């Protein structure tokens, strides 16, 4: 009869790609992030939003502070060296399969810095663009990121699904397997 | 390589016992390094690396900040606590339990991650030859996990969304 | 509709 | 200097359409400056923000009819390019020391009056 | 219309007594702020509170962030505690400070 939680706050700023993220998480699932180029607070279940609000214009301000801070913390240090921290890719489905029954494939990227990744996925060795979702870099409880992958599809005996997952820490582009 | 530069900041909100005991822990990285830490039960901001020194030492002679932020205890964490106990906090999702041939149990779909799963057979909790995938994480609010049992029959489901064990029995 | 509350980020030098 | 904000003229008085130009001096080792227009009846109409030279935020009418600027080691000043009647009023100048806090410090005011 | 219930209007104390000043939030405040204008006089700021109390000579003043409210406390009224008192704060679900309506305090001496 203990209730126990955590709720984080995670925003950054990244060069080059001259991108920044905010976004709620709560006991490790996100709850809301706020798109910065579009300025609207984004839900990650759309029920959430008769609930809350966040008044978006916030977030944007916080980013434009976190990218000068960056600036800083760049010429303060006196050397910057590039480092990275490999992903571990995991694919699975979302509920138990069945044959017939609309399913979603979930490719859990997880442990890894920078947050910078291709990801793509691959139906018989090709790669799919319709049904696919995707989520913002996750916080963790390190300094490393999460990030989720879904793909919405019909099971067949003779489709056969794989993600495949670039980053800069990985000589070869990993691609984890998943078949009936 | 290619080189990036990262500024990172994950303000946690620390919750024991509901809005009872309450810390704040900012932590502020720079690329795959912590080098600043706000921690409420400290009151002030300590560097824990070099790189993050100048931070400590230029924001901790503001007392006007410091009293701000060992304030943000009340005015940030518990005021939001405040709001997601309306929805997030109490949200539940009944699991679904499947078996199917070692025996797994499939227990897929729930929220929250408080699940406890037990194998019996003839009455009695094999408390042994239990291979578990352990809590799985579907990023939408959604949890799933398979027990398995390594016997050459029935399985035990306890869960906050179930006001009575869900059991289910194979032949 | 009640708001969330966040940190306000300060600048660094 | 400090702490003590320095706005002048105490006092202006311009012809409609002329040119009204106020400077503030912000507290010694203040980067935040802050523009509030305050009317008879106490209310405080914020205008313009900046920190040492970017301007952090502003209003539709500080950028259309209002030119401010914030110049490294120089007075910051607020011109109105053609003042009218509805101008006439108290220009407040703020200085802080951290963008994410409060504690303003407010300056003396300058007193505009608008005339035909 | 945006700005911060603030009571009472205007205030008569007879040199050597006290009264309180008191602002009422909408929401949960980050931290709270006072202000004193002089006759001719620019403002002078009071006080900053994140929350408890603080005491500056004859004036205390208090905030509650739950409850939401601050009041300002004036003891042993003076000539010079005459002026319009304003309180400021800025919520914490947004970037923006927010002023109180006015308190205009006149002591007879």
């Known amino acids: 009869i203990k209730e126990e939680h955590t709720i984080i706050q995670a925003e950054f700023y990244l060069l080059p790609d001259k991108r920044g993220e905010f976004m709620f998480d709560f006991d490790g699932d996100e709850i809301f992030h706020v798109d910065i180029e579009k300025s609207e607070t984004i839900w990650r279940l759309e029920e959430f939003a008769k609930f809350a609000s966040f008044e978006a214009q916030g977030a944007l301000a916080n980013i434009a502070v976190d990218k000068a801070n960056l600036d800083v913390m760049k010429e303060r240090s006196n050397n910057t060296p590039d480092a990275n921290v490999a992903p571990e890719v995991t694919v699975l489905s979302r509920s138990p399969v069945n044959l017939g029954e609309p399913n979603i494939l979930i490719c859990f990227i997880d442990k890894f810095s920078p947050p910078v990744v291709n990801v793509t996925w691959l139906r018989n060795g090709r790669p799919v663009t319709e049904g696919v979702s995707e989520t913002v870099f996750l916080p963790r409880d390190d300094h490393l990121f999460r990030k989720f992958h879904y793909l919405t599809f019909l099971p067949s005996t003779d489709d056969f699904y794989d993600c495949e997952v670039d980053h800069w820490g990985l000589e070869e582009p990993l691609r984890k397997h998943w078949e009936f | 390589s290619r080189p990036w530069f990262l500024e990172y900041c994950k303000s946690e909100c620390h919750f024991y016992n509901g809005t009872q005991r309450v810390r704040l822990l900012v932590r502020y990285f720079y690329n795959l390094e912590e080098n600043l830490r706000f921690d409420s039960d400290v009151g002030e901001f300590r560097a824990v690396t070099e790189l993050g020194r100048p931070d400590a030492e230029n924001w901790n002679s503001q007392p006007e900040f410091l009293e701000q932020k060992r304030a943000e205890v009340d005015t940030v964490c518990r005021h939001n606590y405040e709001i997601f106990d309306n929805f997030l906090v109490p949200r539940r999702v009944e699991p679904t339990v499947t078996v199917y041939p070692l025996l797994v149990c499939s227990v897929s779909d729930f929220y929250p991650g408080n699940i406890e799963v037990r194998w019996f057979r003839n009455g009695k909790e094999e408390k042994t030859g239990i291979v578990s995938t352990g809590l799985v994480r579907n990023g939408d609010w959604t949890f799933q996990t398979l027990v398995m049992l390594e016997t050459v029959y029935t399985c035990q489901v306890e869960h906050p969304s179930l006001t009575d064990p869900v059991t289910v029995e194979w032949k | 509709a009640n708001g969330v509350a966040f940190f306000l980020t300060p600048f660094k030098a | 200097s400090g702490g003590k904000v320095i706005q002048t003229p105490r006092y202006l008085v311009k012809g409609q359409g002329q040119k009204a130009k106020m400077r503030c001096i912000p507290e010694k080792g203040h980067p935040v400056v802050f523009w509030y227009q305050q009317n008879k009846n106490n209310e405080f109409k914020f205008l313009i923000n900046?920190?040492?030279?970017?301007?952090?935020?502003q209003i539709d009418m500080t950028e259309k009819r209002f030119s401010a600027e914030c110049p490294s080691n120089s007075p910051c000043s607020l011109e109105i390019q053609s003042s009218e009647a509805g101008d006439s009023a108290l220009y407040l100048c703020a200085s802080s020391l951290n963008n994410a806090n409060s504690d303003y410090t407010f300056g003396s005011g300058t007193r505009l009056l608008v005339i035909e | 219309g945006d700005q911060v219930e603030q009571s009472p209007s205007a205030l008569s104390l007879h040199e050597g007594t006290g009264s309180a000043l008191r602002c009422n939030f909408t929401?949960?405040?980050?931290?709270v702020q006072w202000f004193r204008k002089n006759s001719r006089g620019s403002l002078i700021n009071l006080f900053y509170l994140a929350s408890g109390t603080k005491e500056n000579g004859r004036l205390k003043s208090a905030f509650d962030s739950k409850e939401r409210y601050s009041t300002l406390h004036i003891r042993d009224a003076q000539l010079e505690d005459s002026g319009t008192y304003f309180c400021?704060?800025?919520?914490?679900?947004?970037?923006?400070?927010?002023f109180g309506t006015g308190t205009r305090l006149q002591v007879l001496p």
């Open positions: 400021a704060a800025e919520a914490s679900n947004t970037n923006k400070v927010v």
């Open positions: 929401t949960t405040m980050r931290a």
């Open positions: 900046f920190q040492n030279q970017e301007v952090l935020q």
